[PDB]
Write an enzyme that holds these catalytic residues in place. Sequence first.
Site, PDB file in Angstrom:
ATOM      1  N   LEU A  23       0.817  -1.202   0.000  1.00  0.00           N
ATOM      2  CA  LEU A  23       0.000   0.000   0.000  1.00  0.00           C
ATOM      3  C   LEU A  23       0.853   1.255   0.000  1.00  0.00           C
ATOM      4  O   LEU A  23       0.544   2.209  -0.721  1.00  0.00           O
ATOM      5  CB  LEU A  23      -0.939   0.001   1.206  1.00  0.00           C
ATOM      6  CG  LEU A  23      -2.024  -1.085   1.254  1.00  0.00           C
ATOM      7  CD1 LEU A  23      -2.833  -0.963   2.537  1.00  0.00           C
ATOM      8  CD2 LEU A  23      -2.940  -1.045   0.041  1.00  0.00           C
ATOM      9  N   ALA A  27       9.345   6.296   5.750  1.00  0.00           N
ATOM     10  CA  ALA A  27      10.396   6.130   6.743  1.00  0.00           C
ATOM     11  C   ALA A  27       9.947   5.212   7.867  1.00  0.00           C
ATOM     12  O   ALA A  27      10.769   4.491   8.444  1.00  0.00           O
ATOM     13  CB  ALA A  27      10.819   7.490   7.300  1.00  0.00           C
ATOM     14  N   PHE A  28       8.650   5.214   8.178  1.00  0.00           N
ATOM     15  CA  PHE A  28       8.128   4.371   9.249  1.00  0.00           C
ATOM     16  C   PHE A  28       8.317   2.890   8.951  1.00  0.00           C
ATOM     17  O   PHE A  28       8.465   2.081   9.877  1.00  0.00           O
ATOM     18  CB  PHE A  28       6.645   4.672   9.471  1.00  0.00           C
ATOM     19  CG  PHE A  28       5.816   4.566   8.227  1.00  0.00           C
ATOM     20  CD1 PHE A  28       5.379   5.702   7.579  1.00  0.00           C
ATOM     21  CD2 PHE A  28       5.473   3.333   7.705  1.00  0.00           C
ATOM     22  CE1 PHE A  28       4.615   5.610   6.430  1.00  0.00           C
ATOM     23  CE2 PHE A  28       4.721   3.234   6.554  1.00  0.00           C
ATOM     24  CZ  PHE A  28       4.290   4.377   5.918  1.00  0.00           C
ATOM     25  N   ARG A 142      -6.397  13.722   5.927  1.00  0.00           N
ATOM     26  CA  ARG A 142      -5.447  12.671   5.577  1.00  0.00           C
ATOM     27  C   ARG A 142      -5.558  11.466   6.501  1.00  0.00           C
ATOM     28  O   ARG A 142      -5.231  10.349   6.086  1.00  0.00           O
ATOM     29  CB  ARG A 142      -4.010  13.223   5.601  1.00  0.00           C
ATOM     30  CG  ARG A 142      -3.404  13.456   6.994  1.00  0.00           C
ATOM     31  CD  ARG A 142      -2.156  14.321   6.948  1.00  0.00           C
ATOM     32  NE  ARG A 142      -2.442  15.703   7.326  1.00  0.00           N
ATOM     33  CZ  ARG A 142      -2.386  16.178   8.575  1.00  0.00           C
ATOM     34  NH1 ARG A 142      -2.042  15.378   9.580  1.00  0.00           N
ATOM     35  NH2 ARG A 142      -2.673  17.455   8.830  1.00  0.00           N
ATOM     36  N   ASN A 143      -6.024  11.670   7.734  1.00  0.00           N
ATOM     37  CA  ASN A 143      -6.093  10.621   8.737  1.00  0.00           C
ATOM     38  C   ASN A 143      -7.490  10.045   8.905  1.00  0.00           C
ATOM     39  O   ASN A 143      -7.752   9.374   9.910  1.00  0.00           O
ATOM     40  CB  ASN A 143      -5.602  11.142  10.083  1.00  0.00           C
ATOM     41  CG  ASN A 143      -4.219  11.690  10.012  1.00  0.00           C
ATOM     42  OD1 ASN A 143      -3.321  11.081   9.424  1.00  0.00           O
ATOM     43  ND2 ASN A 143      -4.028  12.857  10.610  1.00  0.00           N
ATOM     44  N   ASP A 156      -4.734   6.230  12.215  1.00  0.00           N
ATOM     45  CA  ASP A 156      -3.456   6.912  12.215  1.00  0.00           C
ATOM     46  C   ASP A 156      -3.292   7.948  13.311  1.00  0.00           C
ATOM     47  O   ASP A 156      -2.654   8.974  13.105  1.00  0.00           O
ATOM     48  CB  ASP A 156      -3.264   7.593  10.860  1.00  0.00           C
ATOM     49  CG  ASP A 156      -1.822   7.937  10.576  1.00  0.00           C
ATOM     50  OD1 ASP A 156      -1.115   8.358  11.513  1.00  0.00           O
ATOM     51  OD2 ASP A 156      -1.399   7.791   9.411  1.00  0.00           O
TER      52      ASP A 156
HETATM   53  C1  LIG Z   1      -3.221   9.093   3.964  1.00  0.00           C
HETATM   54  C2  LIG Z   1      -3.308   7.574   3.997  1.00  0.00           C
HETATM   55  C3  LIG Z   1      -2.128   6.976   3.279  1.00  0.00           C
HETATM   56  O1  LIG Z   1      -1.795   7.468   2.242  1.00  0.00           O
HETATM   57  N1  LIG Z   1      -1.346   5.801   3.836  1.00  0.00           N
HETATM   58  C4  LIG Z   1      -0.162   5.184   3.183  1.00  0.00           C
HETATM   59  C5  LIG Z   1      -0.417   3.737   2.732  1.00  0.00           C
HETATM   60  C6  LIG Z   1      -1.442   3.029   3.599  1.00  0.00           C
HETATM   61  C7  LIG Z   1      -1.458   3.508   4.969  1.00  0.00           C
HETATM   62  N2  LIG Z   1      -2.476   2.776   5.843  1.00  0.00           N
HETATM   63  C8  LIG Z   1      -2.099   2.777   7.226  1.00  0.00           C
HETATM   64  O2  LIG Z   1      -1.105   3.298   7.537  1.00  0.00           O
HETATM   65  C9  LIG Z   1      -2.953   2.127   8.292  1.00  0.00           C
HETATM   66  C10 LIG Z   1      -2.377   2.225   9.715  1.00  0.00           C
HETATM   67  C11 LIG Z   1      -2.515   3.404  10.479  1.00  0.00           C
HETATM   68  C12 LIG Z   1      -1.949   3.436  11.751  1.00  0.00           C
HETATM   69  C13 LIG Z   1      -1.247   2.318  12.236  1.00  0.00           C
HETATM   70  C14 LIG Z   1      -1.105   1.152  11.441  1.00  0.00           C
HETATM   71  F1  LIG Z   1      -0.445   0.058  11.872  1.00  0.00           F
HETATM   72  C15 LIG Z   1      -1.667   1.123  10.183  1.00  0.00           C
HETATM   73 CL1  LIG Z   1      -1.516  -0.340   9.163  1.00  0.00          CL
HETATM   74  C16 LIG Z   1      -4.211   1.440   7.964  1.00  0.00           C
HETATM   75  C17 LIG Z   1      -5.080   0.779   9.029  1.00  0.00           C
HETATM   76  C18 LIG Z   1      -4.615   1.438   6.482  1.00  0.00           C
HETATM   77  C19 LIG Z   1      -5.830   0.785   6.165  1.00  0.00           C
HETATM   78  N3  LIG Z   1      -6.193   0.782   4.847  1.00  0.00           N
HETATM   79  C20 LIG Z   1      -5.404   1.388   3.888  1.00  0.00           C
HETATM   80  N4  LIG Z   1      -5.917   1.329   2.443  1.00  0.00           N
HETATM   81  C21 LIG Z   1      -5.353   2.043   1.270  1.00  0.00           C
HETATM   82  C22 LIG Z   1      -4.249   2.900   1.314  1.00  0.00           C
HETATM   83  C23 LIG Z   1      -3.804   3.503   0.146  1.00  0.00           C
HETATM   84  C24 LIG Z   1      -4.440   3.286  -1.092  1.00  0.00           C
HETATM   85  N5  LIG Z   1      -3.850   3.996  -2.274  1.00  0.00           N
HETATM   86  C25 LIG Z   1      -2.429   4.308  -2.314  1.00  0.00           C
HETATM   87  C26 LIG Z   1      -1.758   3.862  -3.617  1.00  0.00           C
HETATM   88  N6  LIG Z   1      -2.549   2.977  -4.303  1.00  0.00           N
HETATM   89  C27 LIG Z   1      -1.891   2.469  -5.308  1.00  0.00           C
HETATM   90  C28 LIG Z   1      -3.721   3.559  -4.720  1.00  0.00           C
HETATM   91  C29 LIG Z   1      -4.444   4.288  -3.579  1.00  0.00           C
HETATM   92  C30 LIG Z   1      -5.551   2.407  -1.118  1.00  0.00           C
HETATM   93  C31 LIG Z   1      -6.363   2.042  -2.351  1.00  0.00           C
HETATM   94  C32 LIG Z   1      -5.983   1.814   0.046  1.00  0.00           C
HETATM   95  N7  LIG Z   1      -4.248   2.024   4.161  1.00  0.00           N
HETATM   96  C33 LIG Z   1      -3.813   2.067   5.470  1.00  0.00           C
HETATM   97  C34 LIG Z   1      -1.645   5.067   5.129  1.00  0.00           C
END
Ligand SMILES: CCC(=O)N1CCC[C@H](n2c(=O)c(-c3cccc(F)c3Cl)c(C)c3cnc(Nc4ccc(N5CCN(C)CC5)c(C)c4)nc32)C1
Length: 288
Positions: A23, A27-28, A142-143, A156
């Site tokens: 996804l 850096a995290f 964003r969050n 987040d």
């Molecule tokens: C602004 C959000 C953000 O950009 N990002 C970075 C990447 C994913 C990250 N992401 C988490 O960080 C977390 C999280 C938060 C806090 C602690 C922890 F352990 C986690 Cl795991 C969760 C729960 C999470 C759940 N669902 C998802 N779906 C999701 C993300 C991105 C896309 N995109 C990006 C690129 N594609 C190619 C197309 C569109 C899609 C379709 C679905 N992304 C999650 C957060």
Amino acid sequence: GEAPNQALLRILKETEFKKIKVLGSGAFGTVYKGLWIPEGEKVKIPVAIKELSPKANKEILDEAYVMASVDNPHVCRLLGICLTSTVQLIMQLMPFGSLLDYVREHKDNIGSQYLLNWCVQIAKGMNYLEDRRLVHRDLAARNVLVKTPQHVKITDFGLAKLPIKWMALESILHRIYTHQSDVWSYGVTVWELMTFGSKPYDGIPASEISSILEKGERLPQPPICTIDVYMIMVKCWMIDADSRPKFRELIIEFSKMARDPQRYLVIQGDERMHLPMDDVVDADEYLI
Ligand SMILES: CCC(=O)N1CCC[C@H](n2c(=O)c(-c3cccc(F)c3Cl)c(C)c3cnc(Nc4ccc(N5CCN(C)CC5)c(C)c4)nc32)C1
């Protein structure tokens, strides 16, 4: 003191989940789209897996501590944790990504009904965090993550406990954070949604902003906004925080509007829009 915190934290096996696709990478660490299959349960939960030194390991364990303490419909669920060379965090999958990117992606197809329901859903999420004595400290579009176009969740809260442009004034001057400090950032997050993803105070250095609010300036009324909706964002941006509204009240107000959406959001061409492996269950159903 406070009441005992009997949150259960679950340890999962690396064999029990499989990572389909990446996804994001930062850096995290790196976050994977994936599936989680409890041993012998005939279920397949869609998850996001976060994987990444000693200080960092700590950071993720405290994140986990926070996420386990809050479990709700309106805050992303944390499925569990996995103890590996690199500790892995297993969360509920939000298929449509961030509300901020969704709102820019489909600005032309988002109606007023969806907007006001998001405002309600998020206020309900913060009312829960208020009830749990949890100050988010970083509320922003964003969050928020999108489960379906009809359901959004706060996620987040890395910084959560117990980004200058979203911060309440007191937070800027004094590094003070309260629930009423979050109401302010709520207003900014709504302003984000009503302007369909606009950057707040774009073209402005961060160091001016403190003075700006002291002068009395705020963010402008977005076009699609009745003075009813806008009057509300403005109440979140008072200097005195006892005069900002309580998340419970924003739930009630926004809810009222949601019943007659086109009376409060004037969107061009509003009524003409709509919005979008057997064993798989959502994590919200899996827990109980
Ligand atoms: C602004 C959000 C953000 O950009 N990002 C970075 C990447 C994913 C990250 N992401 C988490 O960080 C977390 C999280 C938060 C806090 C602690 C922890 F352990 C986690 Cl795991 C969760 C729960 C999470 C759940 N669902 C998802 N779906 C999701 C993300 C991105 C896309 N995109 C990006 C690129 N594609 C190619 C197309 C569109 C899609 C379709 C679905 N992304 C999650 C957060």
